[PDB]
Amino acid sequence: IIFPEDFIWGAATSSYQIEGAFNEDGKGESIWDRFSHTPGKIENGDTGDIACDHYHLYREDIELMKEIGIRSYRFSTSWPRILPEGKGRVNQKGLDFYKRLVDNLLKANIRPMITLYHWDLPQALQDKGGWTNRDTAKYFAEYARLMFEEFNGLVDLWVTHNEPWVVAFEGHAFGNHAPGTKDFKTALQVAHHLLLSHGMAVDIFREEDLPGEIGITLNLTPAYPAGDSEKDVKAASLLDDYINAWFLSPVFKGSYPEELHHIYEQNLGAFTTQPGDMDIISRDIDFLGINYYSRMVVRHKPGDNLFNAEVVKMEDRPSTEMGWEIYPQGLYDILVRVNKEYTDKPLYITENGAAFDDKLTEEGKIHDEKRINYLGDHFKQAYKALKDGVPLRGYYVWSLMDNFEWAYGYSKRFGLIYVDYENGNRRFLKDSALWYREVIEKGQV
């Protein structure tokens, strides 16, 4: 298991999950500040108010990055830290933070990858409808241009959106994420606008002519039939379209998946689009980021939902603390499938990782063997994709450090680095960090 010497090994984080400084230096309120300050939304009543305090501690975190020896760092930039009202006047101190961060990364010889939108929409824009208001797509594109202007020649890897499926459905259909709406029609409308805003930002990226590459990051969950049944095969196919094709087909083919689009329209009425929208969404991009964690097993079950499809819990197979099945073969399957059916573009694993119950010892050690085993098994499947012709260029571990795990708060730890929040927010390299360091050095597992 040997990787190319120029293979981009990285680690990823997101702004709201690590930064803290939620109302400091002119930053505006985000929907996640609002959501986390609403009673009952987050486990244990945790908030992202302080989190890892990366906003103040970023210079120390870069030192740890160098220690591990990662070649690239994927992070997201907070829209309301930069534009408190989502539009209008720039908050120079918010922007100065990211300028300092980037200059530091480059001096450390770590390649930055910026995600423009990783879920922290300005609350000011939410009060005007958020992602159901087509104007939000335009403001996003103006924000994108601002960032392209400021980081021209400094950042050469760009992702417009992280996981539009999760933003749309978890945030607007099931209400588990900010803003917390529970309206499936709204979800579909939001998904369309996220896609539109993506294409709008790609157009601007070309126009600004800065060097580097732009893509989008999609969470992908391959679906597998629970039985030999042709009926299960079709049900599994449908849930697969629900998560994967719903976003992959517009971006790369310029259309939504037909059968699913029909099912939605007949049960819910049509969501609002304009002519030429599919052209914008499907602009040519430079790479696809894939976020992979697990798979779903599907049986046919008429009634009980719109797709007539039920997800089977695999209780007999290993799982992480999130309750997600461990299934490394899925990572291979999705890379191959993407390269076969959707695109010949370079692919990056922009997130993959696992939560396990981590224990900090007295000498400041964390023996997270299960995380090492999870990561090793997934690296091996990425190698196998690479060997078989997939143009995989890089792999980012989620996450560089323990952080605010959305609705679960701080109770779920995904980091290579343990964060001892209440003791000066001190950082400790887990054994998985030490293992990853050896992997990157030698390019082999």
Residue numbers in the entry: 4 to 448
Paper text:
In subsite −1 of the active site, the catalytic residues Glu354 (nucleophile) and Glu166 (acid/base catalyst) are situated near Glu408.
The 2.0 Å structure of the 2-deoxy-2-fluoroglucopyranosyl-HoBGLA intermediate was obtained by soaking crystals with only 2FGlc and not with an activated compound such as 2,4-dinitrophenyl 2-deoxy-2-fluoro-β-d-glucoside (DNP-2FGlc) or 2-deoxy-2-fluoro-β-d-glucosyl fluoride. It is likely that the covalent complex is a result of reverse hydrolysis. It is also clear from the electron density that the equatorial O1 hydroxyl group for 2FGlc has been removed. The Glu408 Oε1 and Oε2 oxygen atoms participate in substrate binding by offering two hydrogen bonds to O4 in 2FGlc. The puckering parameters [φ = 103.4°, θ = 7.0°, Q = 0.64] are consistent with a 4 C 1 chair with a slight distortion in the direction of a 2,5 B boat/5 S 1 skew boat. The attachment of an electronegative fluorine atom close to the reacting carbon atom serves to destabilize the oxocarbenium ion-like transition state and reduces the reaction rates in both the glycosylation and deglycosylation steps of the retaining reaction.
